[PDB]
């Protein structure tokens, strides 16, 4: 993996407002927000539009 | 509207198989590699095959479909 | 999907090297095979078809090392040693198709230091 070419690969937690569950998945755009789960390994947080697990059709 | 043609380029073999040649003797004139350089033979810039040393000229097969000319002292 | 065989394409590169590099009775070919675990060297007369000297990593007669590059330096040392013993001075270095960088290089470097003239 080259350096000083691509944007950050840093991990970040994604959370849905409805179901309210947390999971780790690395992506761009951190935004820098605190989390509850895994308090030791601090990661950013992003607000997410309604997920699949919440919606009963896809579930 | 025809009537044209280039000079013939006297291509083909210039020394026989089993013939003693001096170093630098042209063996074969050709466009491309009809025949490939063997041992002690070089390919000129126009594909002319020539003896790098004195010796006897030998045309051999070099694998089913191809052919080469060597010079053994 | 199909996974390309490294050795098959390796040997296709080797062909490209052997194109310009042949062993003679005066100057033979230092051929290097490299496996995931160990590495081997041969010194070959391509006019006759006979190997004169051969070092390797899995030899009970001297084969202690730390890293695979270090190990390959030790094999390079032995091949150079055993070559001088036989009475070979000047060799041409066949990469076998491996890129001259990591091991294969350190094998060559370490061999060139001892009694060998690339």
């Amino acid at each position: 993996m080259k350096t000083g070419i691509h944007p950050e690969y840093r991990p970040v937690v994604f959370v849905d407002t409805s179901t309210d569950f947390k999971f780790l998945s690395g992506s761009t755009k951190s935004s820098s927000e605190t989390i509850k789960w895994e308090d030791g390994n601090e990661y950013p947080l992003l607000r997410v539009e309604i997920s699949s697990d919440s919606h009963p059709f896809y579930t | 509207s025809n009537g044209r043609d280039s000079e013939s380029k006297r291509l083909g073999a210039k020394r026989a198989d089993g013939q003693f040649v001096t170093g630098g003797s042209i063996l074969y004139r050709q466009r491309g590699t009809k025949i490939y350089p063997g041992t002690n033979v070089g390919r000129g810039g126009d594909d002319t095959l020539f003896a790098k040393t004195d010796g006897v000229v030998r045309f051999e097969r070099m694998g089913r479909d191809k052919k080469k000319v060597s010079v053994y002292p | 999907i199909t996974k390309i065989d490294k050795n098959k394409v390796r040997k296709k590169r080797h062909a490209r090297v052997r194109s310009k590099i042949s062993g003679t009775e005066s100057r033979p070919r230092l051929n290097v095979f490299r496996s995931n675990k160990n590495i081997y060297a041969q010194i070959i007369d391509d006019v006759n078809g006979v190997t004169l000297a051969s070092a390797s990593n899995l030899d009970k007669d001297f084969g202690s090392a730390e890293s695979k590059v270090d190990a390959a330096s030790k094999v390079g040392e032995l091949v150079a040693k055993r070559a001088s013993e036989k009475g070979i001075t000047s060799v041409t270095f066949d990469r076998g198709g491996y890129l001259y960088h990591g091991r294969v290089k350190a094998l060559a470097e370490a061999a060139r230091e001892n009694g060998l003239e690339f």
């Binding site: 691509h6 944007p7 999971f23 780790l24 998945s25 997410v48 997920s51 896809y58 | - | 999907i1």
Partner: protein, 175 residues
Amino acid sequence: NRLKDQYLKEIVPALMSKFNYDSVMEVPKIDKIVINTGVGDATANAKVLDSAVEELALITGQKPVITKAKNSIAGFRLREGMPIGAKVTLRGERMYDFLDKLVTVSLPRVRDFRGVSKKAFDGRGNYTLGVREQLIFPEIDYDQVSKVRGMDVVIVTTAKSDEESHELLTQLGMP
């Protein structure tokens, strides 16, 4: 992450007992996930390509290599070379960070999807995911770039038979 480990825990034995393989090496595993765009309106103006080279760089994580035309057709108005479409491949511990998104955040913004869309398989044993627009993903949003362009997502598997691939995608998570 939580998916690759979950592949090695509860997807390797069970699945194998369904088809009954000899070794655990035939076990259909995913290789590379290749996402390209293909900007038809690139030859005229290149800023729409820059936006395509910006969006993928916020979706995947690694910048895309710009793909150059192969032959020349006059109908579409194309000439030898010319940058037309971008492409990016995912392999390792960055790739299984691009299937969870599709399991979580991609599907619901799409209207309907009848489980595993059986029509979108080659048969040789690789999947292509039909992607309408870019707003399906959660990083870019529709308040940065002007036009959507579109996307096209391929997923390559070790699977030999299409059925030995269909029964993998589901168990991973993606319907």
